[PDB]
Design a protein around this ligand. Structure first.
Ligand SMILES: [Mg+2]
Ligand SMILES: [Mg+2]
Ligand SMILES: [Mg+2]
Ligand SMILES: [Mg+2]
Ligand SMILES: [Mg+2]
Ligand SMILES: [Mg+2]
Ligand SMILES: [Mg+2]
Ligand SMILES: [Mg+2]
Lengths: 119, 146, 227
RNA sequence: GCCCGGAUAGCUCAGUCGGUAGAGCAGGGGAUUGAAAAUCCCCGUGUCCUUGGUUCGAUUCCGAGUCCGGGCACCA
RNA sequence: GUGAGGUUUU
RNA sequence: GCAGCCUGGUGUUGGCUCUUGGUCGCGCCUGCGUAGGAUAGGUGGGAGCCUGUAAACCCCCGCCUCCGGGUGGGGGGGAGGCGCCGGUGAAAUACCACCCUGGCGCGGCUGGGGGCCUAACCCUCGGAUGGGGGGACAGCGCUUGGCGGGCAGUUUGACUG
């Protein structure tokens, strides 16, 4: 396929998983990995050592394509997004701007009752 | 299948050769339209029995017919349409325009093959493939329906 | 690989030949520019399937002309070795009891001799260097005769073999760079039909497909399978 | 009868895509928990279908079938 | 921004 | 067995287009669990040839990639790359390729699945040799296999306090 250099990127940083996927300026992903490629089950794929072979593998199987920047978009907050994204921010990949799309859930009525014990 | 052509059918070779083609094509698309003929020993005798007396009729009915790009659509003319009716209620077809061009501007057309596919609601440019070994089509430009 | 020597006379490959018998068999002298003792290594093909039982390729045949190739075996002297000054024996070493498993041998094998016939106990113990390529002595090799002095005398000027594993990468070491069709008159006369007489019972198919007489210094020419 | 996938410890099962191997019971006592349940620990049971062969081997690959099944015939 | 396979009354 | 239903082939039944399929090797350059120096396929020659008809630390570079990296056009290099042994092991290359493992251009027929037109065919419109829609599908014939008590012809033995 045609390798791409410029473009934006998408970031998933939920409680159970932290995986990025680098896109084009049209919104087409280029790869995805996980912590399940080692076999990280449950919540063993959070913030400080075992699984930046998800996002850094998402830039490392994209290293053969050679992307320029990763414009950050974070869907799903908490659970240690900071060092997992900042591994890709300043240890090999350039960035253009920091304009984040934080998800703002309302849903009208309730989702699954895990949140409602602490409202 | 011995079929003889009278005009080039855009494929399948030239006129008068011994060409093979499906009977579903030649039987329904070529024979009732008057373009290809079943070739027996009679119709296979006729094309060499007349090599000038009918090829001159192809020169007349084709070389005389390939000059009708003069006063039909290339010159600028206001095409007569119906009264508005801002949004098109009845879409324009190949049939419903030559009586307008027959009332105003005096241009008489077939009116077949003025829409080879998709009789469409909208308006724009369109080419009229008049087909002696088909040549360059004349261009109509519908601009307004008011 | 596509260097200086292949760009010279690559026209003689000719992948659209019609029928060649002699002019693609004898032309190994100067189409193969060799300044050394080369082996012509005549190819062939035995058509079998290597993934079933009752199917064991093995072939050993001799050639009494001389081959330009000596015996060069590693003789180990044991009981019943000498023949009381038989005038053609006791030339190589007679001992040293090599147990060279440490530093894993010396990996330059040309011919292996083994006299005592103890293969039921030394099986997969003496054939340590040659497992899959298999220049180890075997009971199916046919080198078991009446007396002892018939193995060295046949490896000397003889004992060529055809046996393959999973493919047909086969060879026939007979001549030097300058051998004539008077030597092809016992090479391609008896070897290509020796691999047709020697045959496993599961032979079904083409059975003679890719027989190239190609060299180390020259191109790949093709003859008809009978010549 | 041609072809299709397999027979692993009283019970059944973790298997290999050729260099590995078994966990559970009627069982005895066992850090535990302040002497209570057993959460948890040693532990009684491999011709890995019968046999032949590339193979450093076979606890695993391939060939005939004796072991059981579905489709497919065929049965004077 | 964070924590429980979790217990029984002598 | 039949009625009826489903379904492949074929006639009615055509015009195009897209990517896929099969005997398909003329061609591309695909092998890294790997224990040492590794783009290390099993092996065949294995002391010659890469080489001044333009080398080497690695800079040309399409090619694929498991991301390490090797093999072709070589435009500017300028006698240096270093292997048979040691080293790895179930196997020793660098010179000539035997087919498997594969991304792939095409020689034979397009086999199937889609998108458009449509005159055949079908439905429909007041006064219908003309308009609209479906559209080579449906229906119908032959042939092939299956379902099929809805139906028909049938069998369901003998000894016997
Ligand atoms: Mg309590
Ligand atoms: Mg039918
Ligand atoms: Mg349509
Ligand atoms: Mg019609
Ligand atoms: Mg229509
Ligand atoms: Mg039909
Ligand atoms: Mg009945
Ligand atoms: Mg009756």
């Amino acid at each position: 396929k045609r390798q791409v250099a410029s473009g934006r990127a998408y970031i998933h940083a939920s409680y159970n998983n932290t995986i990025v996927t680098i896109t084009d300026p049209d919104g087409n992903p280029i790869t995805w990995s996980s912590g399940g490629v080692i076999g990280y089950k449950g919540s063993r794929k959070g913030t400080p050592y075992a699984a930046q072979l998800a996002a850094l593998d998402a830039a490392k199987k994209a290293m053969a394509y050679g992307m320029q920047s990763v414009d950050v978009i974070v869907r799903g907050t908490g659970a240690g997004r900071e060092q997992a994204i900042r591994a890709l921010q300043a240890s090999g990949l350039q960035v253009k701007s920091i304009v984040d799309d934080t998800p703002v859930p309302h849903n009208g009525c309730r989702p699954k009752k895990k949140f409602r014990k602490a409202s | 299948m011995k079929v003889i052509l009278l005009e080039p059918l855009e494929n399948l070779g030239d006129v008068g050769q011994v060409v093979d083609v499906k009977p579903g094509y030649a039987r329904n698309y070529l024979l009732p339209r008057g373009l290809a003929v079943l070739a027996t020993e009679s119709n296979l005798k006729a094309l060499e029995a007349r090599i000038r007396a009918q090829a001159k009729r192809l020169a007349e009915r084709k070389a005389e017919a390939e000059r009708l790009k003069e006063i039909l659509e290339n010159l600028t003319l206001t095409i007569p349409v119906r009264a508005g009716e801002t949004k098109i209620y009845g879409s324009v077809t190949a049939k419903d325009i030559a009586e307008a061009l027959s009332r105003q501007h005096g241009v008489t057309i077939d009116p077949k093959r003025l829409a080879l596919e998709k009789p469409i609601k909208e308006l724009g440019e369109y080419v009229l493939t008049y087909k002696p070994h088909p040549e360059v089509p004349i261009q109509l430009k519908v601009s307004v329906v008011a | 690989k596509h260097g200086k020597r292949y760009r010279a006379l690559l026209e003689k490959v000719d992948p659209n030949k019609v029928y060649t018998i002699d002019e693609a068999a004898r032309l190994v002298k100067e189409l193969a520019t060799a300044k050394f003792d080369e082996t012509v290594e005549v190819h062939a093909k035995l058509g079998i399937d290597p993934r079933r039982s009752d199917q064991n390729v093995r072939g050993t045949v001799s050639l009494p002309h001389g081959l330009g190739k000596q015996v060069r075996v590693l003789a180990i002297a044991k009981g019943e070795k000498i023949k009381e000054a038989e005038e053609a024996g006791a030339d190589y070493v007679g001992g040293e009891e090599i147990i060279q498993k440490i530093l894993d041998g010396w990996m330059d094998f040309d011919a292996v001799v083994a006299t005592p016939d103890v293969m039921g106990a030394v099986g997969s113990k003496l054939g340590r260097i040659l497992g899959p390529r298999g220049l180890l002595p075997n009971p199916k090799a046919g080198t078991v005769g009446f007396n002892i002095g018939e193995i060295i005398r046949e490896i000397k000027a003889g004992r060529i073999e055809f046996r393959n594993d999973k493919t047909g990468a086969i060879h026939a070491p007979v001549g030097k760079a300058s051998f004539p069709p008077e030597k092809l008159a016992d090479n391609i006369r008896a070897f290509i039909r020796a691999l047709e007489a020697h045959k496993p019972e599961g032979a079904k198919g083409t059975f003679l497909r890719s027989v190239y007489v190609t060299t180390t210094m020259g191109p790949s020419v093709r003859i008809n399978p009978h010549s």
